[PDB]
Design a binder for this molecule. Sequence first.
Ligand SMILES: *C/C=C(\C)CC/C=C(\C)CCC=C(C)C
Ligand SMILES: C/C=C(\C)CC/C=C(\C)CCC=C(C)C
Lengths: 234, 272, 272
Amino acid sequence: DNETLWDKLDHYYRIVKSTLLLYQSPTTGLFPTKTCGGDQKAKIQDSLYCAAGAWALALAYRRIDDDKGRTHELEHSAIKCMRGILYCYMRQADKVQQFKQDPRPTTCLHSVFNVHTGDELLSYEEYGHLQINAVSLYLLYLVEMISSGLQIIYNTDEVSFIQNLVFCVERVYRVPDFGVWERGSKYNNGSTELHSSSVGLAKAALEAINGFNLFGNQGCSWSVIFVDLDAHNR
Amino acid sequence: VISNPLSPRVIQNIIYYKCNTHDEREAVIQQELVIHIGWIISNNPELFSGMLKIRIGWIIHAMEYELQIRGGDKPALDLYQLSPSEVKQLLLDILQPQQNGRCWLNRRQIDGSLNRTPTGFYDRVWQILERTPNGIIVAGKHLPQQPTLSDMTMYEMNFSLLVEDTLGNIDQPQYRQIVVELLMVVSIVLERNPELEFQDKVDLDRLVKEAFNEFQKDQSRLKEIEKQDDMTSFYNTPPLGKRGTCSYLTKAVMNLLLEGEVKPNNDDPCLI
Amino acid sequence: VISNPLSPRVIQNIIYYKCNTHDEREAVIQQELVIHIGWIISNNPELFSGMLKIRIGWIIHAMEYELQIRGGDKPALDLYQLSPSEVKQLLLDILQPQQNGRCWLNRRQIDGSLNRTPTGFYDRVWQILERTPNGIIVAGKHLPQQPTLSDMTMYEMNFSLLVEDTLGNIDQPQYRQIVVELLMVVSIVLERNPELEFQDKVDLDRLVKEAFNEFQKDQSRLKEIEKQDDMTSFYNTPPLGKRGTCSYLTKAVMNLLLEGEVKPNNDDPCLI
Ligand SMILES: *C/C=C(\C)CC/C=C(\C)CCC=C(C)C
Ligand SMILES: C/C=C(\C)CC/C=C(\C)CCC=C(C)C
């Protein structure tokens, strides 16, 4: 095992570039569910992981001064997805206001989007869009990448939406959801239930995003996110 | 039935408009305990163990009925006259564990109206439901072995609702508690006694009465009580004792099991 | 009774002068069978497992009764016309571990006459003795709990001799087998149920009597049989089945037991 650390990362460089970074959507930064078939469907939850995979290799790529520009290619591969993931949610900011006031399966943020436009693909009837983890995993990952130095939140207007995204996640203790496998339960009757995996992610998301500056090292008192301690406790 | 949680807007119309219209003040007392229950479930979680459902409306009936016992031959205190702490302290007193100084009739009224079931009762009826071909019949409901066994699990939460639905028709609360002990009795019978299986349907009502009549003949031999079709002599009888309700019940379940085939075990060889 | 090893002289004295005097040929046939059992207990001891006491005569009377059964409605072979080769073959046949297809009543002649208690029977009646403080009264002979449990130990021979001596008043071998299976049933009930114990002097003759009562009323109600107090039909009926003798003994044991008080167990407290 005399290979330089350049060599082992190049081994992993290939895999991401050939198997994940080749298929990253150039427009919305999203990651399509189906690599082949022409499907436009991109899910919120899985696309978060794909960016994190490039992020994980990007942090490994922080250990080389001669990265040949690979680190920024993989660091901002995560940013492109998260901002595209961020971009998709505003596109539905009217739903966010409704879900904040009346948590319901018909007012929630969507979970599947057009990989090439970010437009909504399946309606509430077609697809069960109430998936708290996807919103929670976004907030948990968003602070996770920002703390490492990636810059995803760009202006104070995004701060308000992410702040409002907290208000939606603050109420997942009582709002049932379809969960990660978009089925709801084993019976698959379309009836929503409370899931520990979805509920736990929001608790972790609220824990990390509490008091976290979305602007990173370049931030002040107007870029922190405030989390209701009572809502987290419930 | 609130199977899944709703929003403050929705529960408002359920509390006042659609549920209760006989008396508007029913909601005010109704709205009281659900805060008190919230206090207990946090400070004393164990106290609400064994009950699958907290029917507060029946708790009010339990709340008011015990005062009739507490008040005796006197106009009892009105639940709408007590201060909330008295309602809370009343709630703690009669939902305490070992109900104290209650003729076992009053324990059975409180426990039966309270729908307090033994810990693992739902697990044991599943086992009862497992090795019974013709399921369980309770006062005009039928709990079959199929598709119940195939569609559920022994620890499954869905199965618990069905058995309660099977027992939901027991109008008389102390009859329900007698039903569960009978349901317990066969459970403590069946799991220790793995050879005896039912052949026909298990109608607990027939199991309940036949225990009572064979109960009736012994006490008639003692003092010849002239009350007929009165369960009161059975409820004040303690579950465990010289002649306890369980001992009467197991005789009933012993005979019905004994009217079927004694299956020899491959695991346990027979000496005779 | 040959309790301790003896000399040829005293054995010759007992075999002719003391033990048998009604028929001198009884000594010769017992003599043959003693040497035959010496052959068998040396080659294949597994058949002699089960009968503590090997009673030579009983084995003979059993041989004679087996001859009577085989011959049917004919003057059967008498044991003294049979060659010792025929004696040995028949004795093995009745000593066979398993009886297949025999009328259960004939199996009760074979097992009861041989005193073939099933494996561990003495240990099981020991557990019985511990769990009945008063003790058991058997055909006019009583095993007390004390000072019996203190003097002998669980796995020694003297306790076996005592329990067999108490089982010495079973003139009908079939009665002996029915009480042996009664003891096995009581042992399984007691071991399987540690909350409940026997509350009085344990009279197994009464238990078998009311088991016969149950069988007789059941048969009269079902098949309209006009026979009264007939022990044969109870003997043919098999232990394990839809209607079995072990079932009726178990019902008798439970009926007698359930009069007593019950106590929850410390290791596993009853949940109701
Ligand atoms: C070997 C299996 C048999 C003989 C089945 C019949 C046994 C009974 C019936 C007795 C079961 C009752 C108790 C163990 C308490
Ligand atoms: C909670 C249970 C408490 C005592 C045990 C009651 C169960 C039985 C009393 C009778 C057993 C009868 C059999 C044939 C096994």
